[PDB]
Amino acid sequence: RARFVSKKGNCNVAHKNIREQGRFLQDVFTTLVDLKWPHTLLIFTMSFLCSWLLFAMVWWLIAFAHGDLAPGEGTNVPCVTSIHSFSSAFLFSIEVQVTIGFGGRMVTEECPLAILILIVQNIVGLMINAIMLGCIFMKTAQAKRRAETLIFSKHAVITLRHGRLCFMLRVGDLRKSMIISATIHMQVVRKTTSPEGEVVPLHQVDIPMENGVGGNGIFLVAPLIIYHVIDSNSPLYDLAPSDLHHHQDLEIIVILEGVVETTGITTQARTSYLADEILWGQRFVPIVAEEDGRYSVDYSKFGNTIKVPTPLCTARQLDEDRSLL
Amino acid sequence: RARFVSKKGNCNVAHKNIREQGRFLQDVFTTLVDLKWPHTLLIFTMSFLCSWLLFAMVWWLIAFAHGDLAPGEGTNVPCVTSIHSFSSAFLFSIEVQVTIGFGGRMVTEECPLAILILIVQNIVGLMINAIMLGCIFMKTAQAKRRAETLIFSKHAVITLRHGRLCFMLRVGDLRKSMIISATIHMQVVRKTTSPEGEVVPLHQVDIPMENGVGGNGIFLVAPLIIYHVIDSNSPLYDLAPSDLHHHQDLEIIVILEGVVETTGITTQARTSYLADEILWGQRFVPIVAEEDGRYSVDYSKFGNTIKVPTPLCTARQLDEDRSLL
Amino acid sequence: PLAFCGTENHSAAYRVDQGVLNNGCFVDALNVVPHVFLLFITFPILFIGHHSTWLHFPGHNLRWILTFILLFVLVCEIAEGILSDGVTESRHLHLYMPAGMAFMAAITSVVYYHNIETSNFPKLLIALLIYWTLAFITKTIKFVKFYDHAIGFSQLRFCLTGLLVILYGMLLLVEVNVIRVRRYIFFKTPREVKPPEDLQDLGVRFLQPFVNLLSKGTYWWMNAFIKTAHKKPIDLRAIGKLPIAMRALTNYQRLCVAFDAQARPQGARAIWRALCHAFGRRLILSSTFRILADLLGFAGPLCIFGIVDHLGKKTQFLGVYFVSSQEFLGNAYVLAVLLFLALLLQRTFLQASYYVAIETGINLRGAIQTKIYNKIMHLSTSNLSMGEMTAGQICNLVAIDTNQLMWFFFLCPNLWAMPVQIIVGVILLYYILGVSALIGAAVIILLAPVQYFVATKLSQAQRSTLEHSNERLKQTNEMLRGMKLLKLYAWESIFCSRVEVTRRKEMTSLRAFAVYTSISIFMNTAIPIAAVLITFVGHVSFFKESDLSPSVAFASLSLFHILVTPLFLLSSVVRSTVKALVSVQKLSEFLSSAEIRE
Amino acid sequence: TLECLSRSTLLCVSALTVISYVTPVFLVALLPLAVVCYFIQKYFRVASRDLQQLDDTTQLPLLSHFAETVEGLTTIRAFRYEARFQQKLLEYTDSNNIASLFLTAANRWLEVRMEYIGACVVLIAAATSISNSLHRELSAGLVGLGLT
Ligand SMILES: Nc1ncnc2c1ncn2[C@@H]1O[C@H](COP(=O)(O)OP(=O)(O)O)[C@@H](O)[C@H]1O
Ligand SMILES: Nc1ncnc2c1ncn2[C@@H]1O[C@H](COP(=O)(O)OP(=O)(O)O)[C@@H](O)[C@H]1O
Ligand SMILES: CC1(NC2=NS(=O)(=O)c3sc(Cl)cc3N2)CC1
C-alpha cells in the first residue's frame, strides 16, 4: 500500500525513464530556487567567491605582464597601484566587484587592458548581483511553508446531513493572515477499470464540494467542515462500512489552493485520506464558541469526532429504502 | 453578540490551543512582512546594526591578536590599517558592509584571517541586504490598504425588484485605479442545526449574487447595487421583518476579491452586515447622474436609503400568495 | 579615554608579543565573544517569535537553580571587578564589562529556554549548547592562564572564574542530559513526553504545580487573576478544577494506604503515624525551605557586623590588581548587595515553605473529610440514639476539629525548623560576642522550666476550654432547635441560665489561659531585655576580652531579636498543638465507633 | 491578633522613624514604596474579597451536606444511595479545597510583593547610611541603629 499524497502533503510519485534533452537545464533559475537553503547559500557564496578569484587571477596576471610585481626602481606607473602579490589582486577584485574601493589599490589610466577588465568585472558583477538578488527574493517570497499552517483533520467522517450520507472533512487556518480566493478541490483516487477493458491505475475523479452555488471557493477564517454529498453521480455511491479498511484502494485527496494576502503568491495545501483513515458513523465536534470578547476556536478539539447513529448500508441502499417508503 | 467580521472588515476570530511545532517559526519572512511598520523598521535597523557590531568585535579582536592596537615602533604591517580602538573597528565594519570604503582603514594582505573575514562579512552583508530588500519590497507592495478604499454601505436593504424580494447592498471604489477581476462572494453566517442533530456554530452558507450569467465577477467603476434574489433555495427564504433585530443571530458577509491594476497583487475587502443593520422596506437612492462633462457619482448619498412600500411577509408567504392567485 | 585595557605604561597591556593567549586582558576580550554571539543569535529568534498545555524538559529545576547561582556569581564578579579597578587612574573595562555582558547573556539564555519550554522547541536548544560550549572554552583558557601565572586561591577572581567554569560545565551537562533524554538532534527521535493530563483538557486553572521556579516562587501566574478580578468578579467558573494530585479522592486513597500499612486499629497515635506516612514528605519539603530561610536570615546580622566594622575603621600580578576574599567581604556596599540578595532568597524560600505547608493541610482536610463521610455511611444509628455522639459533634468534626488539625499542619514546619535556627543563632552569638553570649544564653535557658510550666498550664486550660465549649454549643443548639417549646412553656430563661453556667465554666478556663498567656508574653518579652542587659553589662564590666563596638553590639542585637521572635507565639503554638491533639483524639474515637454489620 | 498587630504596626513606625532620623534622605525614597504598596493593596484587596467570599459560599454546601447526611442516614442507606452521596461529597470538597487554594496563593502573591518591598527598604537604607558614613560622619553607631 502506497499513498499518492502523504498526510503532510507531499506527493510520493517517483518519476523515472525521463530522457533529458536539456529542459531541466534551460530553467537554471527555477532549479536554483528549488534548492534548499544550505544549497542556495552554498551556490550564493560560491558564485561570488569564484568571480572574485577569477578576476583576481586576471588582475594578478596583468600585474605580472606589466612588471608591477617586480621591484621597480622608480618612475614606473603600474596598471593597478599597490599590487605586490596574488592576495593584493584578490583584495582588489573584492574592492572592485562589491564596489568597496578602499583605494590603496586602484586602477591607473596607463594600461587600457586594466580599464577594459574593470568594465568587464563591473558588468559581470552587476549581472551576478542582480541574478542573486532576484533568486533570493523569490526564495524568501515562497509560500510553500505558508501552506504548512493550513491544517487538515487526521480522520474524515461519513455521516448523515439532512438525510444525504455526505463525506465530510475539516480544514483550519492557523495564522490570522487571510488566504485570498481559497478554493477546495477534492478528488477520489482509485484503480478504476472501464467496461471496455481500460485499466487506469490512479484514475482521479473529482468530487463536488457541497458548499455554495456550485463553487469551489471557501472563506476560511474559522475551521470549516467541508462536505461532499454522496449522491447518485458520486464515485462513493457504492461505498459501504464493510469497506474503509487498510487493504482498500480508495483514496480521497483534498487540495486547498489560495493566494496569501501578505505575499501575493498562490499556494496550495495538499492532503490525503486513506480508506482506513475515513471513519463511518462519526461526527466532528464543534470547536467554535462565543467567548466573552468574541468568537474563540478551540484547536485542541480540531480533529475530534463523536460516534453518531448512522445506517450501516451503502448510499444506494439508503436511496432504495427511500424509494420503497 | 459577537461579529464574525467587523464593519471595517477585520475578523474577530480568536485562535487558541494551537500546539506549535515550529510552523510559525519556519516562515520567518511572512511573519516579517506581517509586522507593523515600526516593528519592521526596528528589525531592519537592528539587523544591520547588530551585524556591523558583530563584525566590529571580530575586527577589533584581530587587531588585538596581531598587536595592531599596541603602539608599534615601526616596520609592522597591521591586518587592517589605522585601527586604534573599538570605534575604528566599528567604522571599518560599517565601511566594509555598506561598501563605502573611506580608505583610512583598509585590509592589508598580510593576515589571511583578515581576508577570510572580509569574504565572510561581504557574503553575510549581501545576504542581509538581499533579504531586507525583498522584505521591504513585499511590505510596500501589499494591497491590504488598497482594500480600505473599497467602501461598503452601512445598511443593507431587503426589497422588491421585479417581484422577487431580493437582498441588496452597495459597493463603491474610491480610487480611479481599476481593480481587475473583481469577484463578489456573499455568505450567510448563523448557528444552523441539522435535522440529525449536528450543531455548527458558524455555518457559512454562500448565497448567489444575481449579477450576470451565474458568475461572481463584477465590473466596479461606479458604485453598484449588488443584490441576491431570495428564491426557494436561499437560506433567507424564511426571513421575516419580525426578525432583523439586534438579538437575531443572522449575519451576512460580503467579500470583494480582486487584483489591483497598478501593483498586480490580489486583495479582498471583507464586510459584515448584522440583522439589525439590514433594513426591510427601504431602497438605495441613485447617486450617479449625467453631469455636463461626463457621469458623476455623488458619494455623499452613497449609503442613503428611502422607504419604499414592500410586503411585510416572508418570501415563502409571498410565493404562496402568488400560488393562490 | 575609555579603553578596554587601561592605558598604563603607554598602553603596554595591548602588547601581545609574549603569546597573545597568555597575555592578560585579551582573554577577557575573548570572553565577550560567546555572550555577544548568544545575544545576536537569540534576539531575532525571540523577537520574531497561547499554550495551555506546556510541559517541562528534564533538569528543569536544576537548570533554574544553576542559572540563579550563575547570576549571583556574575554579580559578585562585577562587584570585585569594580573594586579592583578603582585604584588605577585609567578604568579597566576588561574587569567588569565582560562580567556584565555575561550577566545579560545569562538572562537572555534563561528567557530563551523558558520560551522554548513553553513552546516545545527542543531542536533550537542546540544554539544554547553552542553558547555554553563557547563559554566553557573561553572560561577554561582563562582559568588555565590564571593557573599558569600562579594566581592561587587567595585571590577572589580565581575562585570566581573556577565557579564560572564549574557552572558552565554543569549547564553543559544539563544540556547533554536533555539531548540524551529528548533526541532533538539527528537520531531516532523516539521520545515524546506529552502534556500532563490535568493541563491539556480537564480545565484546571491552578497552575502552581506546572509553572517554572521563578513563577513558582514569585507566584507570577496569579497576576492575571489579580487583574481580572478588577474587570469581572471571581466565581466558580474563573476558578477551575482541582489537579489530580490535589483531588480529595487521591489524598483519601493515600491516607487509606497509610492506614492499611499501619494495620499490616484507630487510636490517636495510629492516626498521627498515618498522617506522617501520607503527608510528611511534603512537610519535610516545607521544613527544608524554612530551614534554608532561617539560615539565610542570619546573613542580616553578619552583614551588619561587617558593614559597621568597615565604617568604624593588594597584588599586582599580570598588570591588574587582584582582590582577596577578605577585602571583598570587608568593603561595606558589597555586603549590602549581598544582604539584599540574601533577603530576597530568604523571603522566597519562606513563602514557598508557607505555601507547601498550607497546600499539605488543605489536602489533609480533604482526606480527613472523605474519611469522616466514609465513616458516616458505615456508621450505626445506635451511636446517635444512645447519647454516645450527637449530630452536632459529628458536624463539628468537620467544621471545627479538621480545621484545628489543618492549622496545626500549617504550623508544623516552623516547629520542626526552630531548633536548627536556635543552635546556629547561639553559635553565631558566641562567635560575635564570646563568653558574654554564653551568659545571655544561660539567662535564656534558666527560665525554660518556667516556660514549660506555663505551657503545661496553658495546655490544661485549653483542654478545659474545649471541653466546656463543646457542651455549651450542644446546649445552645438544643435550645435554638426547640425554641418554640421554650417560649410556650416560658422556659427560655432557665435554659439560657444553663448555657450561662457552661459559659461561666468556659470563661473560668479562658481566664486561667489568659493569665498564663500574659505571664508567657511578659516572660518572652523580658527575657530579651534582661539577656541583652546582662550581656552588654558583662561584656565591659566583667570581661575585658574586646571593646564593645557598634558592629558587635548591633549584630548581637539583631541575633537576639531573631532568636526570640519564635518565642513570642508560644501561647498560640501550644493552643494549636493541644487543639490538634484533642481533634485527633476525638477523630479516633469517632472512627473506632460501632458500624452496621453486613 | 490584637497583640501581634500592635507589635507589628508599632515596630514598623518605630523603625521608619529611626531610619528617618539617621538618614532623612530615606524619606525621599519612603514616598514611592508607599505608592507601590498602595497599588498592591489596590489590586489584591479586590481579588481577596472575592476569594474569601467564594471560600465561604463553598463551605456552606459542604457542611450542610454533612448535616443532611447524618439525620437522613437511614433514608440514604435505604435507597442504596451511599455512592451517589459520597460523589456529592467529593464534588463539594473539591470546590471548597480549590477556593481555599486560590485564597492561599493570592495571599502568597501579596506576601511576596510586600517582602520584596521590605528587602528594597533594607537596600535603600543601607545605601544611604553607608554613603553618609563615607561622606558625612554618622559616628559609625547610628548606621548600626538604622540597619538593625
Ligand atoms: N491544536 C492544533 N494545532 C495545529 N494543528 C492541529 C491541532 N489539532 C489538530 N491539528 C491538525 O489535525 C491533525 C490531527 O487531528 P487529531 O489528532 O484527530 O486532532 P486532536 O489532536 O485534536 O485529537 C493534524 O494533522 C494537525 O495538522
Ligand atoms: N463620501 C463617502 N466617502 C467614503 N466612504 C463613504 C462615503 N459615503 C459612504 N461611505 C461608506 O458608507 C458607509 C456609511 O454609509 P452611510 O453612513 O449610510 O452613508 P452616508 O454617510 O452617505 O449617509 C461607510 O462605512 C463608508 O465606508
Ligand atoms: C527591634 C530591634 N531592637 C531591639 N530588640 S530587643 O531585643 O527587644 C531589645 S532589648 C534591649 Cl535592652 C534593647 C533591644 N532592641 C531592632 C531589633
Author numbering:
A (entry chain C), B (entry chain A): 32 to 356
C (entry chain B): 2 to 50, 61 to 275, 281 to 329, 337 to 621
D (entry chain B): 1139 to 1286
Please give me the paper's original passages concerning this structure.
Kir6 are inward rectifier potassium channels that require PI(4,5)P2 for maximum activity.
We purified H175Kcryo-EM protein in detergent and supplemented Mg-ADP, PI(4,5)P2diC8, and NN414 into the protein for cryo-EM sample preparation. The focused 3D classification revealed that the KATP channel core has obvious conformational heterogeneity at the bundle crossings of the Kir6.2 channel, showing a close to open transition at the gate. Residues on the M2 helix tightly seal the pore at the bundle crossing. The side chains of L164 and F168 form the gate, where the radius of the narrowest restriction is below 1 Å. In the closed state, the side chains of F60 on IH pack against T171 on M2 stabilize the closed pore. In the closed state, there are ADP densities inside each nucleotide-binding pocket of Kir6.2 CTD. The binding mode of the adenosine group of ADP is similar to that observed previously. The cryo-EM density maps showed that in the same sample, inhibitory nucleotides exclusively bind Kir6.2 in the closed state but not in the open state. Conversely, the wedging of nucleotide inside the nucleotide-binding pocket of the Kir6.2 channel would block conformational changes that are required for channel opening, providing a plausible mechanism for Kir6.2 channel inhibition by nucleotides.
